[PDB]
Design a protein around this nucleic acid. Structure first.
Lengths: 173, 58, 46
RNA sequence: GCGGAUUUAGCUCAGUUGGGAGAGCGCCAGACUGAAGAUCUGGAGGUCCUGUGUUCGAUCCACAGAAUUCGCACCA
RNA sequence: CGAAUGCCGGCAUGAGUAACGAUAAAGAGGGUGAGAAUCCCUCUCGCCGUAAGCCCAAGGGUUCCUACGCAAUGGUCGUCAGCGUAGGGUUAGGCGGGACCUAAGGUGAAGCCGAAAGGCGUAGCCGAAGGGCAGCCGGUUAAUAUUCCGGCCCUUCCCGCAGGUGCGAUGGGGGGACGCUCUAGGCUAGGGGGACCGGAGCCAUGGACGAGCCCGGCCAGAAGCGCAGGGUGGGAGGUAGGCAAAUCCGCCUCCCAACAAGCUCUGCGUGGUGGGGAAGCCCGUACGGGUGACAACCCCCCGAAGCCAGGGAGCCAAGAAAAGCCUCUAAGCACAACCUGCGGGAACCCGUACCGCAAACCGACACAGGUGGGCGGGUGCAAGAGCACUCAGGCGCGCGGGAGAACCCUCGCCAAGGAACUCUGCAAGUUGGCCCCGUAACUUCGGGAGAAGGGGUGCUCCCUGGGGUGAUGAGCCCCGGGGAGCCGCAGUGAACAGGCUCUGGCGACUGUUUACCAAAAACACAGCUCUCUGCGAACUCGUAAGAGGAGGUAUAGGGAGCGACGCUUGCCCGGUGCCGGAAGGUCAAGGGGAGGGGUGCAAGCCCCGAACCGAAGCCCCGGUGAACGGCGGCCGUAACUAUAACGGUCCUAAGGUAGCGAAAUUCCUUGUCGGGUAAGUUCCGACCUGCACGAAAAGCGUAACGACCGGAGCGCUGUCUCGGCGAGGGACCCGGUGAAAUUGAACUGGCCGUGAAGAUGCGGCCUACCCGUGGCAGGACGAAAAGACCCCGUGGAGCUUUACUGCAGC
RNA sequence: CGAGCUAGCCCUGGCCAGGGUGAAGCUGGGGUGAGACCCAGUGGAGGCCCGAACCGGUGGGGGAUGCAAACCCCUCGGAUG
RNA sequence: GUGGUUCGUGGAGCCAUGGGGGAAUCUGGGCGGACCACCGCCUAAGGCUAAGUACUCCGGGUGACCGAUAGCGCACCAGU
RNA sequence: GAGCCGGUAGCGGGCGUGGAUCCCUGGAUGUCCGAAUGGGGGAACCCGGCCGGCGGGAACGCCGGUCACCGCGCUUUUGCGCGGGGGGAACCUGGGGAACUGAAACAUCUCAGUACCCAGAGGAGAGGAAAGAGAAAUCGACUCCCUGAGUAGCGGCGAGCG
């Protein structure tokens, strides 16, 4: 329903158990409500796997326990991450849905190497952060839009095209 | 859609002639049966009631 | 035949109106314009 | 009917002092083969469109006139 | 001042011809009046009735009643009015707005950016028939009413005292909150039959006095209360402690963790009232009833598309922000704080009248336009706001008489033929409901099927089955069932209700869109392709600020040609945009020195200043097409006859590839063969010398689908062989009413000729009396409009590229 | 100076009488390991079918100093998106 | 790199500034239109300053100005 | 100086030479909106604290008054006590600041620093005692008239501007 929720854990040590499958309608992301120590929760970042069976977190330390996060600092080379934090803590900095994410495909000095999901490769800085594993988008592609225009259903822009209009009309057209 | 509307003023004169053929003629009337007054040939009146029968009033 | 004149109190009053007119530059402006310029009353007054 | 360009040895093509002309392909003789073909040997061959004209002389320069192919062509 | 299709204003024209604003009709009797088709009562009758209903609101806003009255408005009248004058008429602690809550959105001290006016904008405010919230039914005037009366049920706030308890913020928590589609349980609406109760009267007529006609037999209520669901769970502790502060609630654990108890709507009810129609003696017995019997007040029926209820289920595209309730500071009660009782007291600001699927609302008019919600009475129909007739309530359209001609309108009829008319079966007929029997090529196997093709039905009697009906036993309902039979041309009797077929083109398809022409092969699209972007993204508005993007983060957002799917997309980057190169040339400002120069007594003091360095660029080297874009010519040969199997070439970037071809890209053309037909320049099939198809602006095909467009056949019928006849509407005559453009003016013939060259009025001649109405179109180059097709003015405005010049942004 | 034109976009309510068809689902029955997968029953999705309020405005017909500056008539499409 | 000025980039100055350099306080420093020498002129880079010219809502006068289709469009329950 | 309850003439009733109606100036009231300013807001209407009388509160309780926006200094203190603004027909100056049209086109240009929009001061602002003028070793505020000049001159040296 027309709302967002979380995107950056930064009070660590707090056990974060994978609450549950609240596969989510707002950014190609299924998510689970996460249940923290104190009762304090968070509809948190999809990251495929870490089953209903509440069970992880992340933090200063480590526990490359798939899913979970920490700085790229505390980060194993050869690891798939998302929660893609570019600058020193700007929430996640990438891979939303974005199955394939970024790979600690080598890291150097206060700079770490990201094979950049989206399709290229380059680095972030120090203690910066990310959580790895999977996203959770189930192929989250295809699906039919048969007899009608799923689009229009989209509520999402039947902002319909044009470009050949009998006109004078719009911005580079 | 006025296909044809008079083309000329109409001639005062003639115009009037047109009107001309037109004549008033007061109703033929005849004097009463006995209610003695003048009447609409053939009928009882707010004078009469007769004819041969007392149908009418006043 | 939905003309255009259907008067919607709420609205008419609303979309125009003293206050409104004051609200802006233009508004106020032509407002005094008339004021002096010819007498009359004013919008909402109507 | 208007325009642009073209008509050279059998065929496709080249030249702007114009000064006195081939390019490759076809064609006859010589080989090489038992033979023919592809292939080395030689060669033979032209109103440079019709007629004119300027010209010392110009098919390469001009003017008509044939066929070439191309463009063209609307308005109610 | 004729004189500027002149401005202003009068004033005549057609013309007493045209029109009365929906073919839902009227007629009679009496009443009142100066006078009434046009007002009032009244009796015949017609039209609604899903509305021509009553209602909520929107809008208008005294239009309403009552006594007066009619000059104009009222397209005739008019003693009638939604006309005029005057009087009078709308009251609420609990209806509704506020006195509360917030999203959008606006405002907005602070904060942010402008040349100035400004921008943007936190929080707080504004901002709703979205939230919230304390009663209803009878009565009662000319008028108002959930507000006046009365009966019955409440609400908040205040003083007091009584009983009570850590009361005490709003900060916290939970919390009020939600989609869509569907459907269990149960309940008033509402509707139905009762011969069951009450009453006022009938029968006339052949007949029946009898389960006969006819009117009704509820509506409202503290709580107590059993049908009935509706919303939760309980305690301890831990509370690495949060929800910035501590008990809350959140999170872990051990124990009651039920059909448990808890807390918010329906029946009963019933307190008890009201009503209650038919009355009804004074009394109008009549503009009838305002006002007294007395009502009967019972049963079974059927049952909601939203009533409980924030159901329950399934689904994706996955469903708003602040009262009340508990937790608590500050705090202050804490013998005086909150909760709770009872008694006394207190309770405002604006709103109603009538219209109001409309002469009172928008259309400039009492204009058959539109304009949001509420069941929408019944009978028949398979169901149903569809249909025909009606109930309650509404209306007779505001001009009426009168003939019945053409000719227009609307509408019915046909024999025989039965598209041949025509561009076109345009139209209009055929057909049209439910059940059975049957169902083709093709297929993306769903579907093309309602395909097509038949037969069905009407009421009677006879026996048989079943689902709601508390067992089931007047009581209802879906249903056969099969059998026998009856009568008409006819047995969905009338009313509402498909002609099909075959075939081709394009586009898939449902869509949308050119308001007053054009719904199309156009755009939209599900889908595919190159693609720009790493976020403070790329682009779009913006003067900065900023918002947008996106609280989006490359399965993402933006550019984009095609626009299911199926098959497949080929040859050329020599020019071009672009992607990249950046060594080399080049070149702005710049830096940088030789020099020259004026004046200088001289130091000095001012330019010019260039070798050399120096930016993007462009040159040049490459890549580059689901980027612009382009993808040859003629000579020869087997071809007894023709491109061609092969071959000669000349120029370019390579010089059409696979499907397809006279298509809607083929003018020569009705190209030639084929079929279809008595003949066919349209089709549809082949050939293919494709004037000038070609894969991506797709190409060949493609089932389904189309108010698309073309091409066939059976059905049907006045479309058509001409039709003819008829019915209801104007026309025509009557009376009332009583415009309009164009117009110099006019008592205006045919001729043959003539003139500027298509003449009523010039010439010669020939008919020719004066006036009119119903008509028929030919001329008066008729009207309408100072041509929109044209050309002209070194006229205007939109768009285009390697047009000029510039500005923006890069 | 104007979105009470109208097209759009935001917020927030209302609305679609009848009726047809009959997928995913699950229930059970089906020769094999289980299963495919069938069948039947239930089931009630679709910018799905038929049809009115509602919405629309091709096709013919009337009107043309009109009821009217777009209307009336026959007819026609959508009709839980 | 612009403005004013009569100066339209010009032989083209004075003042005013946008952007970078960034002086001298009386032998200081601009000035007299490129510039150079000498002369002549002024003393900036702060402020106030009635009166002499403009204007008409309003009051007065006066008009070879008007007479209701002319005057302001409005001479009187008119910017309605 | 002797009539008056206005334009309404009318009715019905009244005031004044113990200087009335009215002319003037200087008074109190001065409802509600409009800078609006206490708060909100579709103006002219609906909302809030203290004083206020005590008001009926017949054995029961009010309006009225009043009162506080914000930018402005600063006696700062806890800030008390000043000025602002909102007008205005046309006039002024500054901020910003245009096409037609002329050049018989039209890019320079002219229309103009014109129209307009803006901020603002006034009753008039403008400006206003010199880093001036000019050069006769001469002049001396600023402004406004005439004159200077349509000269000196600007310029697709073309219209014109001047």
């Amino acid at each position: 329903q027309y709302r967002i929720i979380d995107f950056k854990r930064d009070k660590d040590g707090i056990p974060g158990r994978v609450a549950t499958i609240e596969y989510d309608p707002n950014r190609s992301a299924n998510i689970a409500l996460i249940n923290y120590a104190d009762g304090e929760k968070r509809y948190i970042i999809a990251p495929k796997n870490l089953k209903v069976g509440m069970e992880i977190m992340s933090g200063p330390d480590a526990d490359i326990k798939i899913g979970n996060a920490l700085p790229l600092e505390n980060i194993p080379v050869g690891t798939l991450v998302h929660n893609i934090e570019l600058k020193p803590g700007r929430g996640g900095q990438l891979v939303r849905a974005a199955g394939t994410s970024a790979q600690v495909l080598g890291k150097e000095g206060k700079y770490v190497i990201v094979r950049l999901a989206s399709g290229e490769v380059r680095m972030i800085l120090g203690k910066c952060r990310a959580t790895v594993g999977e996203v959770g988008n189930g192929g989250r592609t295809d699906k039919p839009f048969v007899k009608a225009g799923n689009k229009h259903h989209k509520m999402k822009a039947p902002n319909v095209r044009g470009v050949a209009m009998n006109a004078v009309d719009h911005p580079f057209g | 859609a006025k296909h044809p509307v008079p083309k000329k003023k109409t001639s005062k004169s003639k115009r009037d002639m047109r009107r001309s053929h037109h004549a008033l003629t007061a109703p033929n009337l005849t004097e009463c049966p006995q209610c003695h007054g003048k009447k609409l040939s053939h009928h009882i009146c707010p004078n009469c009631g007769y004819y041969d029968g007392r149908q009418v009033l006043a | 035949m939905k003309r255009t004149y259907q008067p919607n109190n709420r609205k008419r009053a609303k979309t125009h109106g003293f206050r409104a007119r004051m609200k802006t530059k233009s508004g106020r402006n032509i407002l005094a314009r008339r004021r002096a310029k010819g007498r009359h009353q004013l919008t909402v007054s109507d």
